[PDB]
Amino acid sequence: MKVPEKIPMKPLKGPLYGGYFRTWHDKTSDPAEKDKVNSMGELPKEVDLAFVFHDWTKDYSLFWQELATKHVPTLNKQGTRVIRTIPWRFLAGGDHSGIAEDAQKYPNTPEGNKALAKAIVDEYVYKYNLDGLDVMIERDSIPKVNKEESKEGIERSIQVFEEIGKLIGPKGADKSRLFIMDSTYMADKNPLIERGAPYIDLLLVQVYGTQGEKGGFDNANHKAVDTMEERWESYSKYIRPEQYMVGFSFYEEKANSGNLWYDVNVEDDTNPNIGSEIKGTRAERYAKWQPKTGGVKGGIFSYGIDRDGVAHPKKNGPKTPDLDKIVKSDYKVSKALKKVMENDKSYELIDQKDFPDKALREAVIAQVGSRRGNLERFNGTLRLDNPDIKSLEGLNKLKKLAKLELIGLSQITKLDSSVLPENIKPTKDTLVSVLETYKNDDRKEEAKAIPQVALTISGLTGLKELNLAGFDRDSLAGIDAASLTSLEKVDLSSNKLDLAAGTENRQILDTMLATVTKHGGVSEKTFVFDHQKPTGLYPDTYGTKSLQLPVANDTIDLQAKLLFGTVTNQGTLINSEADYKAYQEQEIAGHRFVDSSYDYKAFAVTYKDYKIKVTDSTLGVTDHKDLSTSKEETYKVEFFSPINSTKPVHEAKIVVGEEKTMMVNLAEGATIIGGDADPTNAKKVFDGLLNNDTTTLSTSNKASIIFELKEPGLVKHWRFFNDSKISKADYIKEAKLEAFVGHLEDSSKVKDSLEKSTEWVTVSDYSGEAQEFSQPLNNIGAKYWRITIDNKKSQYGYVSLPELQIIGHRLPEAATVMTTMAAAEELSQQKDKFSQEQLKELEVKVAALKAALDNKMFNADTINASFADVKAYIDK
């Protein structure tokens, strides 16, 4: 075969139309199938990308010679690129993986994967001198080994994809060949987009059918999911909008359910041409659809373009087997869809009517895009730093700009709303979607707010008038006032500026005031900044983090003492209405700036649905604002916004009386050793959730858990909870807590049979009916514990235990420090073992360890030193 060499082609410019041509429907595929009558060479010039979608066509078929020698030159001559489509798994190996099936020639190694990528491009692109490669990423094409999805092949395919992108596409050695990805997945479910996106020219999304258009439906929340907008936004993270193309499907002959998309017109007996009409079809909606932000899309594509013109069979209606007949297409749908996009307002070119100043016009086209549709949508930064710009006329056409930077524009004299973006002030989105929505959603959300453009002004040395009045600007940041040396008239009134003393805003205003006054002729019309309504925000930090209070019979409001206040975005704190009026009466050059109608409750934030969490030193937890001080206790207090209930906005330590150390739950995350309780729910006893009704029931009616403290310490308290308010009179009514006495029976390899067989010590026997029980404990230092609970119900009582807490202080080998001390008075209440005056030099050291251990401020290093030096006085 002699393959002709590449034909000069005019560059691709959107809007683009693409088509997947099924090879088995080309005349030359199987000469025996006389019904196969179409030809890929017959595709019209309106088709920019003809995709070779291969199946059923034999390796030896004369189609491949026809493609390379006739079709490609014919299509290239008219500007149509011919793209080879291959499935995802061709990049992975394993089942049905094309070239990659030869795992010995192309091993899964760094050099083997480099070789596979070169082989893939040589075989599927260069062999017939095609114009690019399209990798199809869907479940249909996922890497598989023995009919099983292969995570290993998926990982390999990521590597091979990058290697291909170094050969072709925008980052490749041969930039004259397109590297294209199509996918059914949302971007977060596309395993290859994050690494593959820099290497591709175009991204195609298959969104066939009403569910591609509207998204799926969330049955519970009754909302659309994976909408066209949400799909684009997921990929906007990775590609530009002009790289984005969306796909519909023609009606494939003899299609099953699950392959019926209704993307083109349903047949009608009384109009045999209705399949070639496009108005109102999903296909035309896709042609007209545009993202709401970012920019205009790259175009659209069709699957099965050889079926162009065939009407779709009716959903509910008697069969029409005539639609399954194979007829030669005239590609009328494809021609009309291309013309719909080419004639759309969105793809109108930005010209002199929009920006008369060519220097400005060239800056917008370079940065925003050449199409008028981008003015409506562009979402990033427009930097204007060419000093040749003599006019900003046309900037009002930018509707969604995130940042406008005006730098060094010497010859601009005035700035107001006529030469500024339309979103300098609050605006709502005005673009209307052309897509059908869910009838079962009633979705007409009113016109999302457009975030306002951030404005930077630096070096406009000829700027004489700066009018930003009535735009609800949040700050003046970005205004390099010292550089605006020709200002004569400034209006910043009717915004949201905190212009208080010490703010950054005030300094920019004061710098401009100096400039304007030095010019002279200052009147009441010349420098106006009043009617400000600055937004009141929640303070980031609060002033009170520690409070020592005396023991007294009184209740305090913790929220009133610790959490209040409102700040502006410049840091001006207001406590109360009294403080606010002082702020409201501030003056700049003898003139108040805060709007007089903007009262305190309009400005102040509220702490209505803020929650409080108060934990004492024994880890008892309440959510009460009011705290008694009659009892001597040390508390941790945390406040939670309703917006985040896991994560406090403010924390404070309140000491009542002498300070006590905050204890810890040493049984938190304890490992289950033994007992008869259900192992899954037994673990949930120590996870940390006091309302852990993930079914915390341990057995039928009487349960036991043997557990090991993950890192033992000094135990002084314990607590357990019955199912919080979910049940009553099913409560645990009897409980016994036991500690193991450091006597592992010479079988440390087993440690379960040993504990279920030794003699323990009972640290507490609970009998009662409280929802929650807590109790002090006598400095136990055991690593191994057993809890036994009983709700006194029938043998099918299904006793439950949401949490158990073993509470104390972290101190490794606390077992030793109580073994030694226990013997310290098994030796000092009996005289004359070593007894001399040494006995009272013992007793001063035993009285100092019981004092060190039983101290409210637990200091581990103090006890060690007291423990270590009592240890020294035994051998002597």
Ligand X SMILES: CC(=O)N[C@H]1[C@H](O[C@@H]2[C@@H](OC[C@H]3O[C@@H](O[C@H]4[C@H](O)[C@H]5[NH+]=C(C)O[C@H]5O[C@@H]4CO)[C@@H](O)[C@@H](O[C@H]4O[C@H](CO)[C@@H](O)[C@H](O)[C@@H]4O[C@@H]4O[C@H](CO)[C@@H](O[C@@H]5O[C@H](CO[C@]6(C(=O)O)C[C@H](O)[C@@H](NC(C)=O)[C@H]([C@H](O)[C@H](O)CO)O6)[C@H](O)[C@H](O)[C@H]5O)[C@H](O)[C@H]4NC(C)=O)[C@@H]3O)O[C@H](CO)[C@@H](O)[C@@H]2O)O[C@H](CO)[C@@H](O[C@@H]2O[C@H](CO[C@]3(C(=O)O)C[C@H](O)[C@@H](NC(C)=O)[C@H]([C@H](O)[C@H](O)CO)O3)[C@H](O)[C@H](O)[C@H]2O)[C@@H]1O
Q: Among positive and negative, which fits the CA dihedral 368, 374, 375, 381?
A: negative
**How far from the centroid of its chain's Cα atoms is residue 178's Cα?**
31
Q: Select 54 or 684, whichever has its Cβ closest to Ca ion.
A: 684
Binding flag, residue 189, ligand X (CB under 6 A): no
Question: Around 276, how many Cα atoms within 13 Å sit in the side-chain half-sphere?
Answer: 10
Shortest Å, Cβ 207 to ligand X: 10
Which residue is catalytic, options 42, 123, 138, 362?
A: 138
Partner whose binding site includes residue 253, from Ca ion, ligand X, none (CB under 5 to 8 Å by kind): ligand X
59 is an interface residue for ligand X by CB under 6 A: yes
Identify the residue whose tokens are 């205004």: 479
List residues near Ca ion by CB under 5 A.
684, 687, 689, 692, 802-803
Using the minimum distance from each CB to ligand X, give the nearer residue, 24 or 217.
24
- Work out whether 149 is an interface residue with ligand X (CB under 6 A): no
Among 61, 76, 141, 532, binds ligand X (CB under 6 A): 141
> If binding is defined by CB under 6 A, does position 840 make contact with ligand X?
no
- To the nearest 10 degrees (0 to 180), the angle between helices 814-824 and 860-871 is 50
Structure tokens at 475: 């700050």
Interface pattern 259-278 for ligand X (x via CB under 6 A): x-------------------
Task: Please tell me what DSSP assigns to residue 256.
Answer: P
The secondary element (H helix, E strand) that includes residue 236 is helix 228-236
Using CB under 6 A, which of 5, 55, 524, 837 touches ligand X?
Answer: 55
Please tell me the distance from the alpha carbon of residue 243 to that of residue 14, in angstroms, as a whole number. Answer: 9
Using the minimum distance from each CB to Ca ion, give the nearer residue, 618 or 692.
Answer: 692
- In whole angstroms, the minimum distance from the beta carbon of 763 to Ca ion comes to 21
Contact 221, 234 (CB under 8 A): no
Q: Please, which residue, 392 or 789, has the CB nearer to Ca ion?
A: 789
* Of 303 and 580, CB closest to ligand X: 303
Question: Please, which of residues 360-419 interact with ligand X by CB under 6 A?
Answer: none
Of 437 and 774, nearer to Ca ion (C-beta) is 774
Closest CB to Ca ion among residues 127, 683: 683
**C-alpha angle with apex 829: 826 to 835, nearest 5 degrees?**
95
- Contacted by 209, from ligand X, Ca ion, none: CB < 5 to 8 Å by type: none
Helices (H) and strands (E) in the chain, counts: 19, 41
Binding window for ligand X (CB under 6 A); candidates: 8-16, 17-25, 431-439, 782-790: 17-25
Selection from Ca ion, ligand X, none that 77 binds (CB < 5 to 8 A by kind) is: none
Site for ligand X in 203-262 (CB under 6 A): 206, 252-256, 259
CB-CB contact of 141 with 162 (8 Å): no
**Closest C-alpha to 334, from 286, 271, 292, 293:** 286
Structure tokens at 183: 């996918």
Least distance from C-beta 101 to ligand X, angstroms? Answer: 4
- Residue 801: C-alpha distances to residues 676, 679, 769 (Å): 13, 13, 14
Residue 834 is a binding residue for ligand X (CB under 6 A)? no
User: Which residue is associated with the tokens 């190694």?
Assistant: 109
Least Cα distance to 122 among 75, 65, 164 occurs for 164
Cβ-based burial of 444 (10 A; exposed 0-12, middle 13-18, buried ≥19): exposed
Task: Name the minimum Å distance from CB 773 to Ca ion.
Answer: 16
Cα 595 from Cα 531, distance rounded (Å): 4
471 binds, among Ca ion, ligand X, none (CB under 5 to 8 A by kind): none
With CB under 6 A as the contact rule, the residue among 54, 81, 660, 684 that binds ligand X is: 54
User: Which one of the spans 16-24, 163-171, 432-440, 556-564 is the region binding ligand X (CB under 6 A)?
Assistant: 16-24
- Beta carbon of residue 729, minimum distance to Ca ion (angstroms, whole number): 21
Q: Which does 689 bind (CB under 5 to 8 A by kind): ligand X, Ca ion, none?
A: Ca ion
**Cβ atoms of residues 469 and 492 within 8 Å:** yes
Contact status, residue 169 vs residue 179, Cβ threshold 8 Å: yes
Report, in Å, the least distance between residue 685 CB and Ca ion. Answer: 6
Output the residue with the shortest Cβ distance to ligand X: 252
| Options 73, 79, 98, 209; binder of ligand X; rule CB under 6 A | 98
- Of residues 77, 96, 428, 448, which one binds ligand X by CB under 6 A? 96
Q: Is 658 a catalytic residue?
A: no
CA distances from 48 to 253, 277, 335 (A): 25, 21, 11
Q: Which does 172 bind (CB under 5 to 8 A by kind): ligand X, Ca ion, none?
A: none
The answer to whether the beta carbons of residues 528 and 490 sit under 8 Å apart is: yes
Q: What's the min distance (Å) between Cβ of 615 and ligand X?
A: 58
Nearer to Ca ion, 611 or 683 (CB): 683
The Cα 191–Cα 154 span in angstroms is 8
Cβ distance 334 to 46 under 8 Å? yes
- CA 132/CA 291 separation, integer angstroms: 26
- Which residue type occupies 437? T
Q: Which of 4, 35, 45, 56 binds ligand X (CB under 6 A)?
A: 56
* First-residue to last-residue Cα distance in the chain: 103
Q: Based on CB atoms, which residue is closest to Ca ion, 457 or 807?
A: 807
φ, ψ of residue 859 to 5 degrees: the values are -115, 110
Query: Looking at the annotation, which residues are catalytic?
Result: 138
Interacting residue ranges for ligand X, rule: CB under 6 A: 20, 22, 24, 54-56, 59, 87, 96, 98-99, 101, 136, 140-141, 182, 206, 252-256, 259, 303
